[PDB]
Design a protein around this ligand. Structure first.
Ligand SMILES: *[C@@H]1O[C@H](CO)[C@@H](O[C@@H]2O[C@H](CO)[C@@H](O[C@H]3O[C@H](CO[C@H]4O[C@H](CO)[C@@H](O)[C@H](O)[C@@H]4O)[C@@H](O)[C@H](O[C@H]4O[C@H](CO)[C@@H](O)[C@H](O)[C@@H]4O)[C@@H]3O)[C@H](O)[C@H]2NC(C)=O)[C@H](O)[C@H]1NC(C)=O
Ligand code: 2KV
Ligand code: 2KV
Ligand code: NAG
Ligand code: NAG
Ligand code: NAG
Ligand code: NAG
Ligand code: NAG
Ligand code: NAG
Ligand code: NAG
Ligand code: NAG
Ligand code: NAG
Ligand code: NAG
Ligand code: NAG
Ligand code: NAG
Lengths: 727, 734
């Protein structure tokens, strides 16, 4: 048989099939098959054509995406997609009347639109163009301008700035419609005093002079953006007068200093909840605000405030959790770390500070997935005590002891990692199994949790992989100080414990990272194992997530310490296993993992022959405020400046003499600025250490254009193969 | 068997070349720094006296970078806080020490961040540039007279050059020219208002949180150019109560019709200044000869004293029109000019007559006019043994052109085939500086009968050292192509056996008027590769190279990236045909223009070269500066030479790099050949899916010349060449 080759990985030869559906009610979903949109009845599996592919055969633009209005009356068509940062982009939009069969030609959505969204019910539109908000009541009618303060790189109304996009909301959107669309809530960010990161963009060969890209980006300790929050009533908008936006100000506990808006969740038609986080991210407050029908204002009663703090670290995994409100809005369920530091579901009454934990144990809840009148549905890693597995559970709102695992025993050898998609009122759910075996998508009914049918079993891919010498995956743990620390290994085919193999350590090791899991992947590690016979291992030490706060907070204010030492120790335990070749152990990572690779290579352990750092952080003062400060505090003498200075890659330059190093970075990286790698190379040069390097002209943090992606993986394969003496 | 010349020897300067750097102070005395002391030497008898004691340099606290004693010897200017800018420019702090009063001047001090400073040619007047304006000090202790008030960073330059004139026109930061006796101060003013800026990131020390963007007015080929104006101020009529009057000398109408440049300033007498102007299309230039008018206070450049210089086959001059050497009365001058056969020879002109008389001729060229007296003109040429790569001093009777004497040819013919000279203030004495093929030799001579006075430095110390080292040898010879000689040089390993097949590295420049094949003795990276690694390091001078006539030099006019590239490939073919070269192991490397030719050669698909290294290469001519590029390429317009600008890019050759091993190196703060150039090569390589090796150098400029980066690049490059040539490595403890 043949092996899974680099070409197979770079050309996507063996494709993973998915079953991406969009729910449209509590009994029907839409499914895009052969470019045509089908509407499926969930109970009987019968289909009808919703939108036939030929409809737009004369549109004249390639359509990137689509979005049907909740009432199914109109379809929004996305084209001219232009990527900005990780989540952002701009686009052109066209509106089609699905009943009249007419494209909207007057009062259109402008070109270079930043964000657009339908109301949760009906067909109102809200959009952001030139950093201002606009609302369309009817797709054929002129838009009402909501904001007038919009200014590129300065004022953002209803869109996020670089740092909130990346670190807080993981989205460009800063617009939140009320459940029935009466109100439109939005945030406004002000970057006036945020310093700019400047870098050269070379563009096409014809560009005579390079362009300087300038982005407001706050590095650790710098002046941060300010935020304001507003609510406009879209039902009282006028063609003759400018819109009235009511401001909801942050509480006094937050107003005394630098802070962030970290969550927006509507509770009812007249009740909105907001979470605010201090710049020192171990203290947060939730305001529960109500609309006053008689005054037009929004009252956040001090009696409905909920405080959340951490004595051992920061609040939340990456931010405070979102609340899941009951229909009356008088109570909510929220993931909170308990007295033992394990993240569990807490039940709050809006007027009561103390909550009741409805789950418990030495395992964590990952997310609350659906809340109904009788049950709360959640994902957790409780099953077989495996932190790297995922399963759906349901718990009875009137009896916490009434827990049922809905996914645990459906296909236990194939499916140990699930995600779920519930119908509009949770009558049905799609289970998405993603490992250890081939992905499996199934449809279920919540009536009595019974399987309806298999949506996608990846039989086509299984037929293909039967003729390929595929690698296997081992998931196990080592015991350190009477604590379990899990690892995974991508093992070559026909693996023999009596033979010795080179080993590559694939690192992330960031706070709340998890690199040891039950997910099935087709990646670079598949090629290295299948073709090159390299063991590709990953380890979750101190600072990794989903195992409790004693493990996750262990690196609080001390990045570049325990998580680094634990990767070295892991490799020691691996080498001192009879199938590893101690002379050929390598380490690699991208992003935070690039940082840990570099720290490991500069540690003087003598364990690693060689390593690759792709776009690494080198010093924490160069990275953004929101992420860095969460774990490190402020880079001031009064706070944590001493550890900011003690945890640089540069300080370890002399030790790189003991290793072969490949340093890679994209020149247009807006995230981990090229500066970071430019500072590593200069430190290496200053102590006279030889190393290998590669820059990627105009590539960002992803190094993801078709040609650069192919080049980096080809270049890296050569480096590893030469290090491991492979032909 | 003895030890070899190692990379460490090259990087740590283990074997040092001694020099004898002297400064003439009269027609019979020179100054020389020995044991940090300033010694004054009598040229005739070789006796010395101490001018300034080594210890005097320590009564200031700070370290002195350089010094400059005033012509009359009454004062000493002391340079400190030296901060490098471009190739020639820098800023610094200055202190003046009164040699008669034996005290440091502390009042009306030369300001910090001074751009340029110079004494008058006679006496002790000072002229300086601070914040892009000119200032004059009549007496070191007296307040300075502000000459200009228009100075503005990156916009108006008064008496200093902008980036492009410093690099390509004057090879200096200075744009100040004192009259022979210091009565007048002439200066240029450059205006960069509409010149676009090259912007690049500077990272600085690790403590800098946000990188800084460096912005420099830099005109790329075809872009808007700086404008120039020229002025003369009389320093003897300066007033404390009124602003100074600067008289403007305007360019002629033949230049004013379009874009142009000021390309030379040479004083003829106390009251006569000459200027040369060049059109943006550098095949036409005009010399104005301007006299001072006592009846007006102005400078009249009579139309009848103009001198036109043009070229039908290329550009004017080697890199610019030559400088004139005027006779004492200022009524005649001697100037290097290309003749009818295209060989550069000395022409004699009358200031009022258009036709000149060639005083030298032959299939060889004059390199420079070195001194002119009442009876003799002294010059350097490559006439001897018909060797373009050799250099010798000659003298000629101004009264009989056939009466030529070689003053250096036969002093030490096996050791000395490459000379430079330094004449005393009225040419009574001269220092000869021999720089190859043997060890450098410095000797003192008297011009009265060309009598050899004494040996100043024979490098005996270094000879003693190199006797215990297995040194490589140097072969200088030629190949015949189309009945034309093309010279080459080869750094050959010690105990060189012609019966073996050695690997070969081709060390390239190949720029217009380049000369890489010569008789100079060098201690460099090529010495290590030959001595230790047993690699032959060859260099070839093909079409476009200088000092052999215009048929060779102009052959690449409007066609850079053609003949000079093909000729390097052909050279290597002839080298692999020589029998002692291993055809499977031929590499090519080069910096700057040589980086460009390396890249073009590697992308040619010839199959001759296994591997190559391009250090800071030009990749496309539109990315390089106007003055250099346009000289050979014309304008990048459809009407002019855009088609060849597009046809001569490295990027267009990306697919062919599949056949070779490539190392691309570039400094991130290179203000000259912008990192952009290499960033465009790597993107082209990536787009066609070609693998290659790369290395950037954080905050390093075009020289990659800081102690640590210099050591790193040469170490990294040695490893690349050794792996390409299958040569073994050596482990080290740490
Ligand atoms: C998957 O298959 C399902 C079952 O076949 C589909 O559901 C069926 O949909 C149709 C149309 O939406 C419904 O048809 C008519 O229902 C009543 C009569 O109901 C009785 O007969 C049905 C069979 O004809 C049975 O299935 C029922 O159980 C029941 O015994 C009629 O009175 C309706 O008429 C009204 O609407 C029509 C328009 O279609 C007008 O023309 C009439 O004048 C009148 O106003 C419907 O015609 C049927 O009820 C429904 N059955 C069930 C059990 O759901 C389902 O739509 C399909 N899903 C997809 C996505 O394809
Ligand atoms: N910018 C943060 C981060 C990163 C990238 C590059 C370098 C470094 Cl040091 C960090 C890590 C956390 C990520 N994140 C944030 C929201 C919750 C889910 C999640 O996974 C995003 C990418
Ligand atoms: N910028 C011009 C040049 C160069 C550097 C790098 C790349 C390229 Cl393409 C060209 C070549 C000519 C040199 N020069 C100019 C003054 C006269 C004497 C001389 O030797 C200087 C450096
Ligand atoms: C978008 O741009 C195109 C091309 O310039 C133009 O024809 C079109 O009308 C624009 N669309 C809108 C909604 O303005
Ligand atoms: C933005 O903040 C600046 C100060 O950083 C302030 O002057 C300005 O008024 C603010 N703008 C808005 C729209 O709030
Ligand atoms: C709305 O606000 C803008 C900006 O302040 C102003 O130009 C416009 O005239 C206002 N319109 C009305 C009706 O107030
Ligand atoms: C939406 O909610 C608002 C506020 O409670 C209410 O006034 C309105 O009637 C609701 N609309 C619908 C369609 O129920
Ligand atoms: C939050 O962190 C700061 C900085 O370490 C500290 O002063 C404060 O005590 C912390 N809060 C809690 C409740 O631990
Ligand atoms: C284990 O305990 C020892 C002793 O306290 C300590 O040095 C080490 O860092 C601890 N952590 C792990 C995970 O080994
Ligand atoms: C050299 O010696 C002569 C005496 O013959 C003397 O007059 C002269 O000044 C001396 N010069 C120096 C610089 O020592
Ligand atoms: C130059 O700088 C030094 C150090 O800052 C200062 O003491 C001195 O006064 C300056 N000199 C002048 C002439 O301004
Ligand atoms: C510089 O040139 C600009 C035109 O490009 C002109 O407006 C300006 O006055 C000039 N300045 C001087 C001092 O020549
Ligand atoms: C000299 O020129 C400057 C700038 O134009 C002016 O400020 C100053 O008053 C002038 N000096 C005299 C003495 O006229
Ligand atoms: C210097 O030259 C000027 C101009 O010809 C003249 O006026 C002056 O007297 C000369 N001085 C000396 C010392 O020769
Ligand atoms: C100068 O160069 C241009 C462009 O090659 C040419 O057409 C012109 O005839 C030349 N001019 C002179 C003065 O020889």
């Amino acid at each position: 048989r043949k092996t899974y080759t680099l070409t197979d990985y770079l050309k996507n030869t063996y494709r993973l099939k998915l079953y991406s559906l969009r729910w449209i009610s509590d009994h029907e979903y839409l499914y895009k098959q052969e470019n045509n949109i089908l509407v499926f009845n969930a109970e009987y599996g019968n289909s009808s054509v919703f939108l036939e592919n030929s409809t737009f055969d004369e549109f004249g633009h390639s359509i990137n995406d689509y979005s049907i209005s909740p009432d199914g009356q109109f379809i929004l068509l996305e084209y001219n997609y232009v990527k900005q940062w990780r989540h952002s982009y701009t686009a052109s939009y066209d509106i089609y009347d699905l009943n009249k069969r007419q494209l909207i030609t007057e009062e259109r959505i402008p070109n270079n639109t930043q964000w657009v969204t339908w109301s949760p019910v009906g067909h109102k539109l809200a959009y952001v163009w030139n950093n201002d908000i606009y609302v369309k009541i009817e797709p054929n009618l002129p838009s009402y301008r909501i904001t007038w303060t919009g200014k590129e790189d300065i004022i953002y109304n209803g869109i996020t700035d670089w740092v909130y996009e990346e670190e807080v909301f993981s989205a460009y959107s800063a617009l939140w419609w009320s459940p029935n669309g009466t109100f439109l809530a939005y945030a406004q960010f002000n970057d006036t005093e945020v310093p700019l990161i400047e870098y050269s963009f070379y563009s096409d060969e014809s560009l005579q002079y390079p362009k300087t890209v300038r982005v407001p980006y706050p590095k650790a300790g710098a002046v941060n953006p300010t935020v304001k929050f507003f609510v406009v009533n879209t039902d009282s908008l006028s063609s003759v007068t400018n819109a009235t936006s009511i401001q909801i100000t942050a509480p006094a506990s937050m107003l005394i200093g630098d802070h962030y808006l970290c969550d927006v969740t509507w509770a009812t038609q007249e009740r909105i909840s907001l979470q605010w986080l201090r710049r020192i991210q171990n203290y947060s407050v939730m305001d529960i605000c109500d609309y006053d029908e008689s005054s037009g204002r929004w009252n956040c009663l001090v009696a409905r405030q909920h405080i959340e703090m951490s004595t051992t670290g920061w609040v939340g995994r990456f931010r405070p959790s979102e609340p899941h409100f009951t229909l009356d809005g008088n109570s909510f369920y929220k993931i909170i770390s308990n007295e033992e530091g394990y993240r569990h579901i807490c039940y709050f009454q809006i007027d009561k500070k103390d909550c009741t934990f409805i789950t418990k144990g030495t395992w964590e809840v990952i997310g609350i997935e659906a809340l109904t009148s009788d049950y709360l549905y959640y994902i957790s890693n409780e099953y077989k005590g495996m932190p790297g597995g995922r399963n759906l559970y349901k718990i009875q709102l009137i009896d916490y002891t009434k827990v049922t695992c809905l996914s645990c025993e459906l296909n236990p050898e194939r499916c140990q990692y699930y995600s779920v998609s519930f119908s509009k009122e949770a009558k049905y759910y799609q289970l998405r199994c993603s490992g250890p075996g081939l992905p499996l998508y199934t449809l279920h009914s919540s009536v009595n949790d019974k399987g309806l049918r298999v949506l996608e079993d990846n039989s086509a891919l299984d037929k293909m992989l039967q003729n390929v010498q595929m690698p296997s995956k081992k998931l196990d743990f080592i015991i350190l100080n009477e604590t379990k620390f899990w690892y995974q290994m991508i093992l070559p085919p026909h693996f023999d414990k009596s033979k010795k193999y080179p080993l590559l350590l694939d690192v992330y090791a960031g706070p709340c990272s998890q690199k040891a899991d039950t997910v099935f992947r087709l990646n670079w590690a598949t090629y290295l194992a299948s073709t090159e016979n390299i063991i590709v291992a990953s380890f979750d030490g101190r600072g990794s997530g989903y195992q409790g706060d004693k493990i996750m907070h262990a690196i609080n204010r001390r990045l570049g310490t325990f998580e680094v030492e634990d990767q070295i120790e892991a490799a020691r335990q691996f080498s001192k296993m009879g199938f590893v070749d101690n002379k050929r152990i390598a380490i690699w990572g991208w992003s935070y993992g690039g940082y840990v690779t570099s720290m490991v290579l500069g540690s003087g352990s003598g364990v690693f022959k060689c390593g690759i750092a792709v776009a690494p952080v080198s010093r924490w003062e160069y990275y953004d405020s929101v992420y860095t400060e969460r774990y490190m505090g402020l880079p001031t003498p009064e706070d944590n400046l001493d550890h900011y200075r003690n945890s640089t890659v540069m300080s370890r330059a002399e030790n790189f003499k003991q290793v072969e190093y490949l340093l890679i970075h994209g020149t247009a990286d807006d995230n981990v600025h090229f500066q970071q790698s430019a500072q590593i190379s200069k430190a290496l040069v200053d102590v006279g250490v030889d190393f290998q390097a590669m820059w990627y002209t105009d590539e960002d943090h992803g190094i993801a254009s078709s040609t650069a992606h192919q080049h980096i993986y080809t270049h890296m394969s050569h480096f590893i193969k030469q290090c491991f003496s492979l032909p």
